[PDB]
Structures are given as structure tokens and as C-alpha cells.
Amino acid sequence: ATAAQAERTLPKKYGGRFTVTLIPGDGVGKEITDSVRTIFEAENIPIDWETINIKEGVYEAVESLKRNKIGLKGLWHTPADQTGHGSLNVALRKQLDIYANVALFKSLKGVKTRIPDIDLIVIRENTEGEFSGLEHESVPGVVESLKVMTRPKTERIARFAFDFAKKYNRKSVTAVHKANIMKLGDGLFRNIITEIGQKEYPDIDVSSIIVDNASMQAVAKPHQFDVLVTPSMYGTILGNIGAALIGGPGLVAGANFGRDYAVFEPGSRHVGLDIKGQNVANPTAMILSSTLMLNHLGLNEYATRISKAVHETIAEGKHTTRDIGGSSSTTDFTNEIINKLSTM
Amino acid sequence: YGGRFTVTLIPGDGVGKEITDSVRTIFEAENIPIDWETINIKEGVYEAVESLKRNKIGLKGLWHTPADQTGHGSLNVALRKQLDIYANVALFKSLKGVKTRIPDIDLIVIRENTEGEFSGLEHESVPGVVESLKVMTRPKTERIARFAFDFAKKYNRKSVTAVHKANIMKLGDGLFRNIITEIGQKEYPDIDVSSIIVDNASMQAVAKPHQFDVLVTPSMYGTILGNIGAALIGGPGLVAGANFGRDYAVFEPGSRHVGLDIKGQNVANPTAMILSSTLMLNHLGLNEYATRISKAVHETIAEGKHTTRDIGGSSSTTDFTNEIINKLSTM
Amino acid sequence: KQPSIGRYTGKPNPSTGKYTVSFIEGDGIGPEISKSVKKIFSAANVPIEWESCDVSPIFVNGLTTIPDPAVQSITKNLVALKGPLATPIGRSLNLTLRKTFGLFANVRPAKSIEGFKTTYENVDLVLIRENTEGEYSGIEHIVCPGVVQSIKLITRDASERVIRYAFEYARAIGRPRVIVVHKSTIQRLADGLFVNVAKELSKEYPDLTLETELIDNSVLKVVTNPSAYTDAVSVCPNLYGDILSDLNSGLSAGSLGLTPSANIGHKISIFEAVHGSAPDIAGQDKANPTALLLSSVMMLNHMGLTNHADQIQNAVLSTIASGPENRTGDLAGTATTSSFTEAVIKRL
Amino acid sequence: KQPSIGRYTGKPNPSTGKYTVSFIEGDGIGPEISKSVKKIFSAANVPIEWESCDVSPIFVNGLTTIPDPAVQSITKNLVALKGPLATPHRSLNLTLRKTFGLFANVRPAKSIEGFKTTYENVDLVLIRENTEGEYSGIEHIVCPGVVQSIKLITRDASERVIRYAFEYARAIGRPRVIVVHKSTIQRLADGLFVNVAKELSKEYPDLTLETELIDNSVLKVVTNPSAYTDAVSVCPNLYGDILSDLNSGLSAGSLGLTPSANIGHKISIFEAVHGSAPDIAGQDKANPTALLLSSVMMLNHMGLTNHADQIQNAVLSTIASGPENRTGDLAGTATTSSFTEAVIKRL
């Protein structure tokens, strides 16, 4: 039998038209997604959004992505109270085994930053580590949170990172860990990475760095880093350092990869609850990771295109959005992109 | 036949040294073509492992295990865990010349050796609060489950029962009870699979043991049902045992008692050791010998006096051995 | 004297000469087995009035709770006597019963019965079991795909108060020895702590002698010879206790239709029979009060009514269970629950 | 009023006007960096005599212990001031906290006058739990390729850190106190920490309690360090270890200027957090500033306000202005020697 007609495993596509999943999510999510929609139909990109909205219908997001294979999403909100529901950003990833997060911290021309000309990538494991969500209270007032680290899940991310570094001509890959204290947990992580960066991927420079010291170099001398591989937590931390380094959470493209699926989201991971509905938000993040998705499903003439649009727009002084130092609204910034785009 | 085989011998602590010797004597007196590579020992449990890895087969007594805090840890389990000899078989079959409260009893207890409450993971969070972690994994459990059924099939056993506490430890023992019954239904359909809760199992075992055939248990419940069975048939000196991994096999008494108190007294009973010693012969294919020297000890003990202390006799380990070698010299 | 640990706070209801005790008839053979006790109690002039209450569970917050009616009743009268109950129509009933009343120690005796022949003889056993933590804390995890952890919890606080009640109970029934069943062999820390806590308490109870035994031997020795522990009282963590107690009963009677349990809490305490609801024999008057009846005796002693307890046990039931015209179907006997109760009260 | 929680029990040695303080010169640049402090302290007439002791570890029961000489000394004088030491079988610094009941790391990072780094107006204060959390010894191999590291969080340990934070925030006149956490995905663990702060919040009504995810704590601090110049942030062991080393990265780009204070219930040790700098040792190039500021922290902890403010507000802080002063590490040309006299002048 099988091979040609088979292929129930590529991205939903009908006579040239992809069907991508759209999950606006909470906070500036709804606005920042819209920005992309507008730039998309204004460029007449052959994709149709299947768009979903939601407490445990995080089911319907999963089920959708399982059909379409590809998605574009903002962030959901997560409670801190005890009877709160639990991430369901992580739920989405765990249930689809989208185990690899990539965040892209590259500074942008028209943006004032304290240390300029910075280009580093942070790859984190999504399903394990301190995000394993195993915890219990033995006796009252004593709580244990269990942090799982397993060879299989770790070999996986390790190869993803190197594969990624090879594909995008990155010369250095560094494992962030705390192996001097958690000798088994983070130890295993540091070994497996360096171990399989030496007997496979010999062309790439593998190294380790202790998470706290990594945090210090990142803030003080970031140019020394190229690609960083981390477990769930250290990636949130180095991530936000990188986010700040380049301007803010609104400039960071992100993507999540599993073997079968791919979900693209902002690389910084902030909801912007406070400025919801104010049309003050910055869609650079969303759009740029939206371009990442195009390159993925093979379009990328469009991607190469609409990235240059936003890149030039923000470099070109005013008409840029609030947080970069402009006075324009999400709406106005979007239209400058679609405008620059209409003349390419 | 023709050729020689090199088996590992680990006498170990307590009556170990005497009870092994009994076997040696019966072996050279029967001129069995096996040569002992014999080892003695704190952390040279390494050399035991390394030996067994060469020879693949072994015959051993029990080592002693401390209860104090700075004591070393089983190293009976260490041996097994490091060789992944994951399956323990104990044979509780009553013997003719032995007074027991319930007679004509024949049951087998298969336990998993490497996992469960023998996983030895524990910690003290704050002072005075201790957690012991009990691991149960599908792979290790599917393994023992099949071993049990395979075993039951091979030795024409009709019933296999999983002992558990799944009503309370719904994930741990739950997984165990499912995986067993689950793969006794879609494979091994000829065999009767069932479950029983460990505490109730313990009650039936003591009161009405004939209802059981083969019992499959995690590390702890096997120690418990094991000792019930040990008592049921006479005592720890009558129980043959064996441990199996995929590559290796180590034969030991099925009751697992050191006899520290009677070390060097020559009062000990070697039936256990010898009988599991015959298990080993059947294994490495001899078993003409095995069939032989088992009938020897079986008849010896059935034949009233000349039997060893604990069975109700007045003979010493030395004397009992020699009656076997004697009965043996006339076959 | 009584064990200091779970001490009853008496106080007979000033308006009547009597003490107040919650019943909980339970279901199945519960009702018949119950009033069987009420009658026998009446006849012997027990200073006790019954305040029956219903533990049929509510479900406040999805987590099964027990009704206020029954809570107030049982917290008030510091004692209750429950029969068997079913497996409720949809977070263990018995568990939320211990958790809401702070019960922490299971006391389980298994003694041979006069005139009922089983395979084991002269078995007179007493075992105290930790019923709070150990293997039976709710803590278990899926650490990854095919890997599970069940967590055994052992604390000094929980261990201390069980081990105490054991020393004090051993003293209260005149047994010299008290044995700590354990497995420090391979559970160094967990069972080690339990053992040390007994060894340290040992000193403030110099009349009793403390021994330590591995379940290995505890089970081996008891089955080979049950009487070697007739001066016993064994204390042990939750799991070893659950098994050894069901085992001990298997030795004494071959089932547990004769076994009484006592669940001691700090200020409250519940006394129950450990057999089931026997739904198929219910109403037909074939049940056997002996089980619950002996739990009544245990209760009496816990309350201080020595004279009555000894009366209802030493004579009555224990003695009326001699002569097959008495007895019940479960013991070869021919008598009904009905005839057993009057046949009992005669020698009361 | 200094924080009730780690209160110094004064008592100057009745025979001398002075208080007794254990030193622990430490090794490497320790000796030179040390007497540098002894001199500056002398000049300002500090009520303090030095009882130097050696923490070179013994090994009672395979487990590394600390010498009786030093134990008696430090338990006696309720305070000590250690410089950097090398890496001699149980973390030396760990068995140091365990034997003296130290439970709270206090880490300030403030911009230095006359030393230009990339970040400006950074004035940060962070209290870190140094007992439990991610850093309890508890980890397990649950089977072949599977490991568990166990994070421990208790109310008792949390309470007393969070207290010292409210009380320290009060003692230095900062209005706000921020509990860094991640209740988001560590519901129980970090949740307990947070609730314990929220509950303590009420018996300290002069301070305002905020709660922040490390997410934002790191994002916001790097975008704008000054937003926390009325700070005092409290957090569990790991977040603390990282944020503090981060904060230092913002303030000075390294940590050759960073002072730490390790507060215990009745004892307390004050150390510099830089290394032994073995290669610059003896050549008189070290930079006392780090240890020196820990001296100041110590003074305040002891109650000697006037002297502390004296040695900090003037001196060092001010003498680190003019490149003829300063040290090699700050572009300066001065020696450890010349820095110390150049300091004492404005002392």
C-alpha cells in the first residue's frame, strides 16, 4: 500500500490553502492576533484561520491542532490562587508533546537598547523539569515539588537544539544548568547535552554554564552567547533577560515544536492583561513569530516580505508603537506595515 | 555427557557456610561435573556480581543485613538489582515425613526483586518526617507478569493470582494488578488469572491455603506470603528457591533466613539449600542427578529418625547429609 | 486504670444515671445485629443510653463529608459503636470517618473461641496498628509515562502516639512484652524511625519489655505457633498492621466474622465489627452479634465500666457460644440471632 | 531599630571598651583585603577587637565539620566577618551555615559613584532563603534513566525569612516588599511561600506587600533597575541565588563589589562574595571595597550606626571618586595599600 495519498500528517491544505489554528488567548492576545489577520488578508496569504476560544476546552485547542498540525497563538492567563486551574499554556504543549520552545532575541534597528547588536537564541524543554507539576504536602506546612528529568526527553531536546543550530548556522550551543547542586537532575541534563554534541554534531561548540552565573553574564556581557539550551525554568529566566536586552516582550518571536505539530507564539510569554482593549499594544512579537510560521509551512516569500515590512517600519522612527518609544496605536502600526507592504 | 561447568558459590552469612558444604559433599559424592568458583566478602558484592557475569549461574545462601542507620544495606538485593535477576521463585510443597498443621500443600510464590518497596528510595524532608518512595513501572511489571505465566505454563500450573493493595494505592498496586490480569487475558488465555488483596490473601493463606496455586507479588507482599508459606510446610529449611534474570540465574533458599544464632553448631537443616541446588541442576540440564538426589533427601526425611533437629529429629547437619549420600549410593 | 492516650472523658448525663453513646446501626445485618446488642446491654443494667445516628455521607466540595447530625452526636458523647456499612452510592467512607474524628490507632485482638474448632489453637493475639500515615497516605505520583511513585510517610509525632497507646494498653491488660514489627532492614529511615521512637519511649515504661521483630519473623513465628505471642501487644506501621491483623484473625477463626476492632482517637473513639454488611442474610435473623458484641466489651473497658465488660464477655456470649443448640449458622450452630440473644442474657 | 529576627546580643567585653568579632581572614587576597579593613576600622575608633579564627575543615565522620577553635569563637562573639576562601566533602560554605544556623542571605547591589557601568541608578536589595527550597540535599534515581530533585518549602523556614525581610525593609526605610515566586506552575511550593508572606503582611502594616513572578522580576529589573529602589525582595533559595547574582551583574557587571550578609537566629556572618583571586594575591592589587561594605552591613547589624554610616557614606564610597584612588578592577591606579590610607583620610 502506502505513501502518496497517505500523508495525513502534513499541515491541513486544500487546493493551495492551509488551514491554520488561531488561538488569540487572554490579554492583548485578541488585538495582537488581529494585527496578523489584517496583514495576512491585505497580503492575500492563502491561509484560512480555524479560530478557537475558551475553562477545560483547552481540549478543543488540542483537538484542532491535531487536525491542522499548525497553529498561531497568544498567551493564556494563569491564576496564582490555590483553586486556580493551572497553566493550560503548558497543558497545550504537554498534550501535544510540543516539547521544544525557541525564542529569538535579536535587537532591532530603530530601538534604543542599553547593549546593542545582540543576537541570541534560547531553546527550552517544555514538558519536563520544574514544569512537571508534581507536588504534594506531606504534613501541614511542608510541601515537596518533584522535578523530573528523563534521558529520553533530554536526548530529544538536545538533538533538537543542535539540529536547529546546524540548520540556522549557529556556531555555539551552551547548556544552562545547576548541576553543582542538583547533581542527578541537572547533572543528567548537562551530560546528555555535551555528550551528544561531541559524538554527533562535532562541528558545533558545546559548553556548559551554571544558571546563576549565566544570568549574570547575560545581563552584563550577552554577546558571548549564541544558543542556550535549558530545562523549563532556566529558560523562563534567561528568556526574560533576553527579552529585556532587546527592548521588551513585544519584539520577541517564538515558536514551539513537537515531532508532528508546531505552534507559534510570542517568544517572551507575557499576557498584557493590564492593557487589554486599549489598542496600545505592540504586535511586533506576534507578527514576527507569525512570519516564522510562514517560513515553516513553506510560504516565506511572504515571510521574507512582511518581516522586512515591520523591520523597516520600526527602524523608521515615529509611527512606531508606545513601548518602543513611539506614540502610535496597534492599529496605526499595523497599517504602516500594510502600507510599506503595498509598495514592495 | 561430557564436559565441565563452572558455577558460582556464595556461602554467605549464618548457617550459610554449613548448608552450602552439605551440597558440596553430596555433589562430589555423586561426582557431578561442576566446579565451584567460590567467593567471600563489605562492598566486594562487586566480586560476586563480576563472577556471576562470567559463569552466568550461581548457588548461594543469604547474607546478613543490619538494621542500624549506618549499616550497609541488603546486598542480597544489591546482587539481584545489579544483575537484573528480577524474578524470585519460592516453592512451598509439604514433605512426607514432616508434621504440619495443614497437610498436602503445594503453592508457588513469584515476586519481583528489583522494584516496589525494595526500590530503596527514601528521604527525610524536615527532621522527624520520612518519606519512602515505592516505584512501580510498566516495563518491570510486564516482565514479571510474563515470567509468572510462562512459569505456570511450563510447570503445568492452572492458576495465577496477583496479590496487591490496589484499593488504597490505586496507582502503584493498581498498575500491578492491571498489567498482570491484562496480559493473562490476551496472552496465556489457558491460565486462570485473578487478584487478591494482600491482607485478605494473608488470611486465606493461613486458614485455607489449598485454594492458591501460583501467587505473583511485588517485593514486599512476597516476603510476607513467602513466610506464611514457609511456616505452612514446616519451616525455612524445607523451601527451595531460585532467582531469574534474562541472562543470569542464582539459586538460593526460598525462605530467606540467615540462621545467625546457630552458626557453627552443625544443627542446621540443609534441605532448603540442597533442594534449590537440585533446581539448579535441572536448570543447567543435568537433572538425571537432580531427579536423583531429590528423591534421596525426600525419602531420607520421610523415613523418620536420622532427620535434622527442626523437623523433629535429633541428627546434625553432618549426619543428615550422610544419610542422603548413603541412600544415594544404592540407586 | 485505662491507657492514658485515648482516655474517655466520662460524665454520665446528669438527668439520667446513664452515659450517652452514639450507635450507627449501619446497614445490612447491622440493624438486627444492633438491637441484639441493645437488649443484652439493657439486661445487664448498663449505665448507657443509645443516641443512634446516621453516617450516610454528604459531599461538601466534591470531597465526601459526614453529616452534622452524626458529627455533633459523636463529638459530644466521646464514644460510638458502629456496625457494618455498605460501599456508598458514589473518598473512602471509613477514611473520612477517621479523618473527621481524629482516630489514629486500630486495636485488633484475635482470640480462639471456646467451642468453635479451627485449625490453629490457643491463639490469643493483640495488635495495635498505625491508621494515619505510612503506606496509606494519599501521596502517589506519575513521575513520567510508565513510572509511578507511591509514598510511604512516617513521622515521629504519629508514631509516638501509637507506640504509647501500645505500651499503655499492654500495661492495661497485663502483658509483659511489647513487640515493634518493622523492616529496618531495607526501609532504614522509614521503619528505622518507627523503631527508634519505640526504643526511646521504652524507657518511660520500665514495667514492659520492648522487643523488635521483622515482619519476616512476626509472620513466620505466629503461624508456626500462635501462642508464642499470648503475652504480646505488637505495634506496627499502617501496612504491616493491616496485613498482620487480617492474618491474626485468619489464625483465630479462619475468617473475620468474629473479629472486633477498636479505633482509638485522641478524645473520641469508635468501636466496630470488621465483617461486612452480609446483605444476603439480612433480615432473615441469621447474623452473628458476637463480632459487634465483643466490640461493645472493648468499648465498656475503654469507658471504665470494667465490671460490666467482664460480665458481658467472661460470662455470656463467650460462654453461651458453648453448646451447638446455641451458636449461629456460621459456627455450625442452629440458633438464630434471636435465640442467641436470649440464650446469652440467661448467663448474663 | 535593627530587625528583631536576627538580633545581635551586644555586650562589649567588660575588660576592654570593645566588642569581640571573629575574623576569618580567609586565603588568597583574603589576608591583604583583611588587614585593609582592620586598619580602616582602627582609625575610625570602632569599639571592636578582632579574634581571628581558622575554618579549615576537619572531617569528623566523613562529613566535613568546622574546627572547635573557630566554633567556640564564633558562637561566643555572636558575629563574624569572613573574606574569601578556596575549595578544600560537603560544601565548606554549606557546613558553615548548618553549624551556625544561618538561614537568610541579604544581597544589596547599588551603583558605585565614579565607576561607569551599562546600567544606572541601580539600588537593589534582595533577601534569599538559604536553608531549603531547590537546595535541599534530596534527590533520587527512581529508575534507570529517571531522576527526581526535590524542592522543599516549609512554613517555618519561610516565615522567618519573610519576617527578616519586612523588618529589614522597615529598618532601611523602604515602603514596598516584593515576594518573588512562581505560584503559576509551582502551586503548592511557591504558593505556600506567597501565602506565608500574605499572612505576615498584616502584622507589618507600615510596609506594602506586592507579589511578582520571577518572570516579571527579571524582566522589569533589567529594563529598569530603579523601579525597585524602594525594594527589598524576598524569595526561595533558587530564585534568590539567581536574582542576586543577576542584580550584581546590573550594578557592577561582576561581583567584585558585592557584599553579602548571612543572618542566623543568634549568630550572623558577613562576607564578600568574590573569590580568592589567587593570581593577584600578595601583589597588593585586591579591592577591599567588597569586604569593606560587608563590614558596614555588620556594623549596622550590631547597632553601631554612626560608625557604619561614617565608614560608608564618607570614606570608600567617596574615595572611590578620583582615578588616582580606585583599584585596577575599576580603571584606577591605586594599590590596596594606597586605597586604604586614601580612604582613612576622608574617614
mmCIF file of N, CA, C and O in Angstrom, chain D residues 6-31:
data_model
loop_
_atom_site.group_PDB
_atom_site.id
_atom_site.type_symbol
_atom_site.label_atom_id
_atom_site.label_comp_id
_atom_site.label_asym_id
_atom_site.label_seq_id
_atom_site.Cartn_x
_atom_site.Cartn_y
_atom_site.Cartn_z
ATOM 1 N N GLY D 6 17.118 38.640 63.536
ATOM 2 C CA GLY D 6 18.473 38.146 63.711
ATOM 3 C C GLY D 6 19.265 38.970 64.704
ATOM 4 O O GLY D 6 20.475 39.143 64.555
ATOM 5 N N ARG D 7 18.575 39.466 65.726
ATOM 6 C CA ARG D 7 19.130 40.451 66.657
ATOM 7 C C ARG D 7 20.466 40.102 67.294
ATOM 8 O O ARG D 7 20.636 39.037 67.901
ATOM 9 N N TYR D 8 21.405 41.033 67.161
ATOM 10 C CA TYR D 8 22.690 40.942 67.834
ATOM 11 C C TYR D 8 22.509 41.074 69.345
ATOM 12 O O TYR D 8 21.786 41.946 69.811
ATOM 13 N N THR D 9 23.158 40.201 70.107
ATOM 14 C CA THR D 9 23.206 40.352 71.555
ATOM 15 C C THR D 9 24.539 40.994 71.941
ATOM 16 O O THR D 9 25.526 40.305 72.174
ATOM 17 N N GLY D 10 24.548 42.323 71.986
ATOM 18 C CA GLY D 10 25.758 43.110 72.162
ATOM 19 C C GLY D 10 26.736 42.629 73.220
ATOM 20 O O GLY D 10 27.393 41.599 73.048
ATOM 21 N N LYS D 11 26.845 43.385 74.312
ATOM 22 C CA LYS D 11 27.809 43.084 75.367
ATOM 23 C C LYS D 11 29.254 43.292 74.893
ATOM 24 O O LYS D 11 29.880 42.379 74.346
ATOM 25 N N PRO D 12 29.771 44.522 75.058
ATOM 26 C CA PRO D 12 31.209 44.723 74.858
ATOM 27 C C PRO D 12 31.978 44.037 75.975
ATOM 28 O O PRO D 12 31.527 44.038 77.119
ATOM 29 N N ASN D 13 33.112 43.436 75.629
ATOM 30 C CA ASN D 13 33.976 42.751 76.590
ATOM 31 C C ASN D 13 34.333 43.654 77.770
ATOM 32 O O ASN D 13 35.171 44.535 77.635
ATOM 33 N N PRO D 14 33.703 43.423 78.933
ATOM 34 C CA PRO D 14 33.817 44.323 80.088
ATOM 35 C C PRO D 14 35.244 44.808 80.398
ATOM 36 O O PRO D 14 35.396 45.928 80.880
ATOM 37 N N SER D 15 36.266 43.999 80.124
ATOM 38 C CA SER D 15 37.649 44.411 80.405
ATOM 39 C C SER D 15 38.144 45.505 79.437
ATOM 40 O O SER D 15 38.904 46.387 79.833
ATOM 41 N N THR D 16 37.708 45.446 78.177
ATOM 42 C CA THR D 16 38.005 46.500 77.204
ATOM 43 C C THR D 16 36.703 47.192 76.820
ATOM 44 O O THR D 16 35.626 46.616 76.954
ATOM 45 N N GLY D 17 36.786 48.429 76.346
ATOM 46 C CA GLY D 17 35.584 49.122 75.910
ATOM 47 C C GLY D 17 34.924 48.429 74.724
ATOM 48 O O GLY D 17 33.787 48.731 74.356
ATOM 49 N N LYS D 18 35.639 47.461 74.158
ATOM 50 C CA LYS D 18 35.341 46.924 72.837
ATOM 51 C C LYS D 18 34.420 45.696 72.789
ATOM 52 O O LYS D 18 34.257 44.979 73.780
ATOM 53 N N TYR D 19 33.827 45.483 71.611
ATOM 54 C CA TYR D 19 33.104 44.264 71.265
ATOM 55 C C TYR D 19 34.070 43.269 70.620
ATOM 56 O O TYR D 19 35.067 43.665 69.994
ATOM 57 N N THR D 20 33.760 41.981 70.747
ATOM 58 C CA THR D 20 34.577 40.941 70.131
ATOM 59 C C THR D 20 33.957 40.413 68.835
ATOM 60 O O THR D 20 32.771 40.074 68.787
ATOM 61 N N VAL D 21 34.772 40.359 67.785
ATOM 62 C CA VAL D 21 34.327 39.877 66.485
ATOM 63 C C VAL D 21 35.347 38.915 65.884
ATOM 64 O O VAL D 21 36.528 39.248 65.775
ATOM 65 N N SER D 22 34.885 37.725 65.499
ATOM 66 C CA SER D 22 35.737 36.748 64.830
ATOM 67 C C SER D 22 36.037 37.225 63.411
ATOM 68 O O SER D 22 35.171 37.803 62.749
ATOM 69 N N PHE D 23 37.261 36.998 62.941
ATOM 70 C CA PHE D 23 37.597 37.472 61.611
ATOM 71 C C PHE D 23 37.494 36.414 60.522
ATOM 72 O O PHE D 23 36.597 36.481 59.685
ATOM 73 N N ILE D 24 38.391 35.439 60.521
ATOM 74 C CA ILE D 24 38.477 34.534 59.378
ATOM 75 C C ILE D 24 39.019 35.319 58.198
ATOM 76 O O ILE D 24 38.271 35.641 57.280
ATOM 77 N N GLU D 25 40.309 35.645 58.232
ATOM 78 C CA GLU D 25 40.937 36.354 57.126
ATOM 79 C C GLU D 25 40.690 35.654 55.796
ATOM 80 O O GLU D 25 40.579 36.302 54.755
ATOM 81 N N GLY D 26 40.597 34.330 55.828
ATOM 82 C CA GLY D 26 40.450 33.560 54.606
ATOM 83 C C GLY D 26 41.766 33.517 53.854
ATOM 84 O O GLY D 26 42.760 34.075 54.320
ATOM 85 N N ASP D 27 41.780 32.860 52.698
ATOM 86 C CA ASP D 27 43.011 32.748 51.923
ATOM 87 C C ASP D 27 42.969 33.543 50.623
ATOM 88 O O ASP D 27 41.959 34.161 50.301
ATOM 89 N N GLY D 28 44.076 33.531 49.887
ATOM 90 C CA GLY D 28 44.186 34.306 48.664
ATOM 91 C C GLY D 28 44.379 35.780 48.960
ATOM 92 O O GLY D 28 45.225 36.155 49.768
ATOM 93 N N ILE D 29 43.591 36.625 48.308
ATOM 94 C CA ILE D 29 43.667 38.053 48.570
ATOM 95 C C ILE D 29 43.053 38.377 49.931
ATOM 96 O O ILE D 29 43.000 39.535 50.347
ATOM 97 N N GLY D 30 42.589 37.338 50.617
ATOM 98 C CA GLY D 30 41.967 37.488 51.921
ATOM 99 C C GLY D 30 42.800 38.266 52.925
ATOM 100 O O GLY D 30 42.351 39.282 53.447
ATOM 101 N N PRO D 31 44.022 37.789 53.214
ATOM 102 C CA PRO D 31 44.909 38.473 54.161
ATOM 103 C C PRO D 31 45.054 39.974 53.890
ATOM 104 O O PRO D 31 44.799 40.774 54.795
#
